[PDB]
């Protein structure tokens with residue numbers, strides 16, 4: 401067990417191993433507090449997240465366990481990884497606090513798509529890396545569910561990592577009105593049409609790719625209904641085959657109240673883009689999720705010919721998510737979490 405030291409940072413007690421020095425606050429939220437630090441063991445400028453009220457309810461205890469399981473599993477160059485996890489507790493009986501440690505991220509995609517000139521070669525490399533990371537995530541039967549520019553970290557060398565997986569955390573208020581939290585979401589999840597699956601993430605990649613090519617949000621809706629009208633004007637209204645897959649009768653009645661519209665010509669929307677980029681966007685931005693291109697299929701598209709290497713696009717180890725259907729007490733979720741903190745092994 402390392403030696404721990406205590407300090408107060410913006411109204412909060414932090415108790416951390418001596419290895420972590422020069423702690424300085426970075427962010428605050430409902431789910432945790434974050435400090436930057438220097439890790440003397442590794443030499444990395446690390447990010448440290450302290451969880452708030454991790455075991456306050458059954459829902460909160462299960463979310464803590466879910467986040468720790470997911471983040472310990474993810475071992476890929478284009479995905480967030482865990483450098484460390486710890487608690488100052490010496491036993492289950494005194495266990496209350498959980499701290500998570502990652503590499504400190506600088507810029508997000510927003511910080512390079514807002515203010516920088518992107519060549520077609522930059523768009524190829526950035527979207528290639530997102531799809532490489534998604535092939536790995538989807539091979540474990542994990543859905544990210546919240547891909548958007550603020551959840552993609554990018555360094556000075558245009559190297560990219562996916563972060564901030566959806567832990568089923570977003571509220572109705574967060575998704576309301578003229579908000580980036582909804583502009584990248586697939587229409588079937590935005591409007592609760594049907595059981596969604598991993599195809600929702602490919603819709604989000606299409607929205608991101610379009611915005612890197614134009615410098616403008618693809619579907620900046622002022623509310624759910626405005627955003628659906630923007631989507632159907634580009635991709636066309638649904639045919640009988642998709643309407644049959646929408647489970648809500650009222651959602652089906654509403655769609656049928658709209659005048660029919662054909663799919664637009666994407667070469668006339670993405671004026672002057674690489675024809676291979678236009679082709680790939682037509683394969684991602686398909687209304688019927690069964691018909692969208694997958695991450696593994698997209699990596700083999702001719703748009704990525706200068707980067708694609710089928711011997712350097714790894715899949716994940718199998719991921720057991722059977723706990724998601726399990727009914728447990730707060731103290732049972734807390735014991736499961738404790739076992740996962742104490743069994744952690746750091747990366748090489």
Ligand SMILES: Cc1cccnc1N1CCCNCC1
Pocket residue numbers: 434447448449471480500501502503504505563564
């Ligand atoms: C520090 C941390 C721990 C666990 C999960 N995510 C974390 N962060 C990673 C990127 C930096 N921004 C904030 C989130």
Ligand SMILES: [Cl-]
Pocket residue numbers: 402403417418419420
């Ligand atoms: Cl230490």
Ligand SMILES: [Cl-]
Pocket residue numbers: 479480481482503561
């Ligand atoms: Cl990482």
Ligand SMILES: [Cl-]
Pocket residue numbers: 487488489494495496497498
């Ligand atoms: Cl504790």
Ligand SMILES: [Cl-]
Pocket residue numbers: 510548549550551580
């Ligand atoms: Cl964003």
Ligand SMILES: [Cl-]
Pocket residue numbers: 718719720721
């Ligand atoms: Cl597993």
Ligand SMILES: [Mg+2]
Pocket residue numbers: 550551564
């Ligand atoms: Mg985020």
